[PDB]
Symmetry: D2
Protein backbone atom coordinates (compact mmCIF):
# COMPACT_ATOMS: atom_id res chain seq x y z
CA UNK A 1 0.00 0.00 0.00
CA UNK A 2 1.05 3.58 -0.75
CA UNK A 3 3.03 5.65 1.75
CA UNK A 4 2.53 9.38 1.28
CA UNK A 5 4.52 12.12 3.01
CA UNK A 6 3.61 15.82 2.94
CA UNK A 7 6.21 18.34 4.14
CA UNK A 8 4.98 21.89 4.70
CA UNK A 9 6.56 25.03 6.12
CA UNK A 10 5.43 25.14 9.76
CA UNK A 11 5.11 28.94 9.99
CA UNK A 12 3.85 29.73 6.48
CA UNK A 13 0.32 28.77 7.52
CA UNK A 14 0.29 25.86 5.07
CA UNK A 15 -1.04 23.16 7.39
CA UNK A 16 -4.60 23.91 6.30
CA UNK A 17 -3.97 23.19 2.61
CA UNK A 18 -1.79 20.22 3.57
CA UNK A 19 -4.52 18.63 5.70
CA UNK A 20 -6.96 19.22 2.84
CA UNK A 21 -4.78 17.55 0.22
CA UNK A 22 -4.21 14.75 2.74
CA UNK A 23 -7.94 14.09 3.02
CA UNK A 24 -8.39 14.33 -0.76
CA UNK A 25 -5.95 11.43 -1.12
CA UNK A 26 -7.30 9.42 1.83
CA UNK A 27 -10.81 9.81 0.41
CA UNK A 28 -9.95 8.85 -3.17
CA UNK A 29 -7.52 6.01 -2.38
CA UNK A 30 -8.98 4.85 0.94
CA UNK A 31 -8.09 1.27 0.01
CA UNK A 32 -4.71 1.65 -1.69
CA UNK A 33 -3.12 3.86 0.96
CA UNK A 34 -1.16 2.65 3.97
CA UNK A 35 -0.98 6.16 5.37
CA UNK A 36 -0.66 9.86 4.58
CA UNK A 37 1.73 11.66 6.90
CA UNK A 38 1.95 15.39 7.52
CA UNK A 39 5.39 16.74 8.40
CA UNK A 40 5.56 20.24 9.86
CA UNK A 41 8.73 21.68 8.31
CA UNK A 42 10.92 24.77 7.91
CA UNK A 43 10.71 27.92 5.80
CA UNK A 44 9.20 27.88 2.33
CA UNK A 45 9.15 24.10 2.11
CA UNK A 46 6.20 22.25 0.58
CA UNK A 47 7.07 18.87 -0.88
CA UNK A 48 5.09 15.66 -1.35
CA UNK A 49 6.36 12.09 -1.65
CA UNK A 50 4.65 8.85 -2.66
CA UNK A 51 6.40 5.55 -1.98
CA UNK A 52 9.68 7.44 -1.83
CA UNK A 53 9.08 9.24 -5.12
CA UNK A 54 8.79 13.03 -5.07
CA UNK A 55 5.55 13.92 -6.82
CA UNK A 56 5.59 17.62 -5.93
CA UNK A 57 7.99 20.42 -5.06
CA UNK A 58 6.76 23.99 -4.61
CA UNK A 59 9.67 25.81 -6.23
CA UNK A 60 9.97 23.27 -9.01
CA UNK A 61 6.25 23.51 -9.80
CA UNK A 62 6.09 27.19 -8.92
CA UNK A 63 3.09 26.76 -6.65
CA UNK A 64 0.66 24.31 -5.08
CA UNK A 65 -1.06 21.27 -6.69
CA UNK A 66 -4.66 20.98 -7.73
CA UNK A 67 -6.52 18.09 -6.20
CA UNK A 68 -6.88 16.48 -9.63
CA UNK A 69 -3.18 16.70 -10.53
CA UNK A 70 -2.03 15.27 -7.20
CA UNK A 71 -4.52 12.41 -7.40
CA UNK A 72 -3.26 11.60 -10.83
CA UNK A 73 0.45 11.61 -9.94
CA UNK A 74 -0.35 9.32 -7.01
CA UNK A 75 -2.47 7.04 -9.19
CA UNK A 76 0.37 6.57 -11.69
CA UNK A 77 2.59 5.29 -8.87
CA UNK A 78 0.24 2.70 -7.40
CA UNK B 1 12.72 14.29 20.60
CA UNK B 2 10.20 14.72 17.80
CA UNK B 3 6.94 12.85 18.34
CA UNK B 4 5.63 10.32 15.83
CA UNK B 5 1.85 10.02 15.92
CA UNK B 6 -0.21 7.36 14.14
CA UNK B 7 -4.00 7.44 13.77
CA UNK B 8 -5.82 4.30 12.61
CA UNK B 9 -9.46 4.72 11.61
CA UNK B 10 -12.02 2.39 10.08
CA UNK B 11 -11.96 3.15 6.35
CA UNK B 12 -15.70 2.63 5.75
CA UNK B 13 -17.13 3.95 9.04
CA UNK B 14 -16.83 7.51 7.78
CA UNK B 15 -14.26 8.35 10.45
CA UNK B 16 -11.66 10.05 8.24
CA UNK B 17 -13.23 13.45 8.93
CA UNK B 18 -12.80 13.25 12.70
CA UNK B 19 -9.34 11.71 12.22
CA UNK B 20 -8.16 14.54 9.98
CA UNK B 21 -9.54 17.01 12.53
CA UNK B 22 -7.73 15.43 15.47
CA UNK B 23 -4.61 15.33 13.32
CA UNK B 24 -4.78 19.08 12.73
CA UNK B 25 -5.46 19.74 16.41
CA UNK B 26 -2.18 18.02 17.26
CA UNK B 27 -0.18 19.53 14.39
CA UNK B 28 -1.46 22.96 15.42
CA UNK B 29 -0.73 22.60 19.14
CA UNK B 30 2.61 20.78 18.87
CA UNK B 31 3.81 22.21 15.54
CA UNK B 32 7.38 22.20 16.86
CA UNK B 33 7.53 18.96 18.86
CA UNK B 34 5.99 16.73 16.19
CA UNK B 35 7.93 14.88 13.51
CA UNK B 36 4.70 13.84 11.81
CA UNK B 37 1.09 12.78 12.28
CA UNK B 38 0.07 9.88 10.06
CA UNK B 39 -3.45 8.83 9.11
CA UNK B 40 -3.94 5.12 8.44
CA UNK B 41 -7.16 4.08 6.72
CA UNK B 42 -8.07 0.79 8.43
CA UNK B 43 -10.65 -1.99 8.76
CA UNK B 44 -14.00 -2.28 10.52
CA UNK B 45 -14.65 -0.53 13.81
CA UNK B 46 -11.01 0.34 14.39
CA UNK B 47 -9.97 3.72 15.77
CA UNK B 48 -6.67 3.72 17.63
CA UNK B 49 -4.01 6.37 18.19
CA UNK B 50 -0.31 5.91 18.94
CA UNK B 51 2.37 8.35 20.08
CA UNK B 52 6.02 7.31 19.85
CA UNK B 53 4.86 3.70 19.85
CA UNK B 54 2.64 4.15 22.90
CA UNK B 55 -1.10 3.60 22.49
CA UNK B 56 -2.84 6.70 23.83
CA UNK B 57 -6.32 5.81 22.60
CA UNK B 58 -8.47 2.80 21.72
CA UNK B 59 -12.15 3.19 20.83
CA UNK B 60 -13.49 0.08 22.54
CA UNK B 61 -11.24 0.56 25.57
CA UNK B 62 -12.35 4.19 25.96
CA UNK B 63 -15.87 3.50 24.73
CA UNK B 64 -15.84 6.33 22.23
CA UNK B 65 -13.77 9.11 20.70
CA UNK B 66 -11.36 11.55 22.43
CA UNK B 67 -11.93 15.21 23.05
CA UNK B 68 -9.39 17.58 21.64
CA UNK B 69 -8.21 18.47 25.17
CA UNK B 70 -7.78 14.90 26.40
CA UNK B 71 -5.77 13.85 23.35
CA UNK B 72 -3.51 16.90 23.57
CA UNK B 73 -2.84 16.11 27.17
CA UNK B 74 -2.02 12.44 26.62
CA UNK B 75 0.40 13.46 23.87
CA UNK B 76 1.92 16.18 26.04
CA UNK B 77 2.69 13.70 28.83
CA UNK B 78 4.68 11.61 26.35
CA UNK B 79 6.58 14.62 24.92
CA UNK B 80 7.98 15.46 28.38
CA UNK C 1 -37.51 22.31 4.17
CA UNK C 2 -33.73 22.58 3.96
CA UNK C 3 -32.03 23.20 7.30
CA UNK C 4 -30.10 26.35 8.18
CA UNK C 5 -27.28 25.71 10.63
CA UNK C 6 -25.21 28.36 12.43
CA UNK C 7 -22.04 27.67 14.43
CA UNK C 8 -20.65 30.42 16.67
CA UNK C 9 -17.15 29.86 18.02
CA UNK C 10 -14.76 32.00 20.04
CA UNK C 11 -12.43 33.59 17.48
CA UNK C 12 -9.30 33.50 19.66
CA UNK C 13 -9.85 30.24 21.56
CA UNK C 14 -8.53 28.25 18.60
CA UNK C 15 -11.93 26.63 18.09
CA UNK C 16 -12.25 27.15 14.33
CA UNK C 17 -10.69 23.75 13.66
CA UNK C 18 -13.31 21.81 15.62
CA UNK C 19 -16.04 24.05 14.22
CA UNK C 20 -15.00 23.41 10.61
CA UNK C 21 -14.91 19.70 11.41
CA UNK C 22 -18.40 19.59 12.91
CA UNK C 23 -19.57 21.64 9.94
CA UNK C 24 -18.26 19.02 7.52
CA UNK C 25 -19.75 16.18 9.56
CA UNK C 26 -23.17 17.76 9.10
CA UNK C 27 -22.68 18.70 5.44
CA UNK C 28 -21.54 15.14 4.77
CA UNK C 29 -24.39 13.39 6.61
CA UNK C 30 -27.21 15.73 5.55
CA UNK C 31 -25.87 16.83 2.16
CA UNK C 32 -29.42 16.86 0.77
CA UNK C 33 -31.43 18.25 3.69
CA UNK C 34 -29.15 21.21 4.43
CA UNK C 35 -29.49 24.65 2.87
CA UNK C 36 -26.22 25.74 4.45
CA UNK C 37 -23.93 25.50 7.46
CA UNK C 38 -22.47 28.84 8.50
CA UNK C 39 -19.43 29.44 10.68
CA UNK C 40 -19.44 32.61 12.77
CA UNK C 41 -16.16 33.72 14.31
CA UNK C 42 -17.21 35.08 17.71
CA UNK C 43 -16.01 36.47 21.05
CA UNK C 44 -14.53 34.95 24.19
CA UNK C 45 -15.59 31.52 25.39
CA UNK C 46 -18.56 31.30 23.05
CA UNK C 47 -19.41 28.07 21.22
CA UNK C 48 -23.06 27.72 20.31
CA UNK C 49 -24.88 25.91 17.50
CA UNK C 50 -28.28 26.66 16.00
CA UNK C 51 -30.50 24.69 13.61
CA UNK C 52 -33.43 26.44 11.94
CA UNK C 53 -33.34 29.01 14.72
CA UNK C 54 -33.32 26.38 17.47
CA UNK C 55 -30.30 26.22 19.79
CA UNK C 56 -29.05 22.63 19.75
CA UNK C 57 -25.82 23.28 21.64
CA UNK C 58 -24.33 25.61 24.20
CA UNK C 59 -20.85 25.04 25.60
CA UNK C 60 -21.50 26.17 29.18
CA UNK C 61 -24.91 24.55 29.28
CA UNK C 62 -23.48 21.23 28.03
CA UNK C 63 -20.19 21.72 29.82
CA UNK C 64 -18.11 20.96 26.75
CA UNK C 65 -18.19 20.14 23.05
CA UNK C 66 -20.54 17.77 21.16
CA UNK C 67 -19.68 14.41 19.72
CA UNK C 68 -20.29 13.96 16.05
CA UNK C 69 -23.07 11.46 16.80
CA UNK C 70 -24.95 13.62 19.33
CA UNK C 71 -24.91 16.66 17.05
CA UNK C 72 -26.13 14.67 14.05
CA UNK C 73 -28.95 13.33 16.11
CA UNK C 74 -30.08 16.70 17.46
CA UNK C 75 -30.08 18.04 13.90
CA UNK C 76 -31.94 14.99 12.60
CA UNK C 77 -34.73 15.47 15.17
CA UNK C 78 -35.30 18.98 13.85
CA UNK C 79 -35.42 17.94 10.21
CA UNK C 80 -37.50 14.80 10.68
CA UNK D 1 -18.55 42.49 8.53
CA UNK D 2 -18.27 40.35 5.40
CA UNK D 3 -20.82 37.66 4.49
CA UNK D 4 -19.32 34.89 2.37
CA UNK D 5 -21.27 32.14 0.59
CA UNK D 6 -19.71 29.07 -1.04
CA UNK D 7 -21.88 26.95 -3.34
CA UNK D 8 -20.47 23.56 -4.34
CA UNK D 9 -21.84 20.59 -6.27
CA UNK D 10 -23.07 18.16 -3.61
CA UNK D 11 -22.11 14.96 -5.47
CA UNK D 12 -18.89 16.11 -7.16
CA UNK D 13 -16.96 15.50 -3.95
CA UNK D 14 -16.17 19.22 -3.63
CA UNK D 15 -17.09 19.71 0.02
CA UNK D 16 -13.50 19.03 1.06
CA UNK D 17 -11.99 21.86 -0.99
CA UNK D 18 -14.91 24.10 -0.01
CA UNK D 19 -14.38 23.52 3.71
CA UNK D 20 -10.67 24.20 3.21
CA UNK D 21 -11.22 27.49 1.39
CA UNK D 22 -13.75 28.37 4.09
CA UNK D 23 -11.13 27.93 6.81
CA UNK D 24 -8.51 29.84 4.81
CA UNK D 25 -10.86 32.83 4.84
CA UNK D 26 -11.99 32.41 8.45
CA UNK D 27 -8.34 32.20 9.51
CA UNK D 28 -7.12 35.21 7.51
CA UNK D 29 -10.11 37.50 8.14
CA UNK D 30 -11.18 36.19 11.55
CA UNK D 31 -12.11 39.73 12.58
CA UNK D 32 -13.66 41.14 9.40
CA UNK D 33 -15.96 38.19 8.68
CA UNK D 34 -19.51 37.83 9.96
CA UNK D 35 -19.71 34.29 8.62
CA UNK D 36 -18.69 31.90 5.86
CA UNK D 37 -21.52 29.66 4.70
CA UNK D 38 -21.20 26.39 2.80
CA UNK D 39 -24.11 25.55 0.51
CA UNK D 40 -24.30 21.99 -0.81
CA UNK D 41 -25.54 22.43 -4.39
CA UNK D 42 -26.35 20.71 -7.70
CA UNK D 43 -24.24 19.37 -10.56
CA UNK D 44 -21.04 21.10 -11.61
CA UNK D 45 -21.70 24.21 -9.54
CA UNK D 46 -18.93 25.92 -7.59
CA UNK D 47 -19.49 29.62 -7.00
CA UNK D 48 -18.37 31.99 -4.25
CA UNK D 49 -19.99 35.24 -3.12
CA UNK D 50 -18.77 38.02 -0.83
CA UNK D 51 -21.26 40.59 0.43
CA UNK D 52 -23.50 39.71 -2.51
CA UNK D 53 -20.69 40.09 -5.05
CA UNK D 54 -19.68 37.00 -7.03
CA UNK D 55 -15.92 36.63 -6.62
CA UNK D 56 -15.66 33.21 -8.26
CA UNK D 57 -17.41 31.03 -10.82
CA UNK D 58 -15.89 27.68 -11.84
CA UNK D 59 -16.83 27.79 -15.54
CA UNK D 60 -16.01 31.46 -15.84
CA UNK D 61 -12.60 30.94 -14.25
CA UNK D 62 -12.24 27.45 -15.78
CA UNK D 63 -11.27 25.86 -12.46
CA UNK D 64 -10.82 26.41 -8.74
CA UNK D 65 -9.21 29.36 -6.88
CA UNK D 66 -5.87 29.44 -5.18
CA UNK D 67 -5.97 30.42 -1.54
CA UNK D 68 -4.04 33.60 -2.35
CA UNK D 69 -6.30 34.74 -5.20
CA UNK D 70 -9.48 34.17 -3.19
CA UNK D 71 -8.06 35.97 -0.15
CA UNK D 72 -7.22 38.87 -2.36
CA UNK D 73 -10.64 39.16 -4.04
CA UNK D 74 -12.25 39.10 -0.60
CA UNK D 75 -9.83 41.71 0.73
CA UNK D 76 -10.68 44.13 -2.09
CA UNK D 77 -14.35 43.98 -1.10
CA UNK D 78 -13.85 44.08 2.67
CA UNK D 79 -14.14 46.99 5.08
CA UNK D 80 -10.37 47.52 5.38
Amino acid sequence: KAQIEIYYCRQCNWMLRSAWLSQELLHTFSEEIEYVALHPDTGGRFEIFCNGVQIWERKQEGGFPEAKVLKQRVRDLI
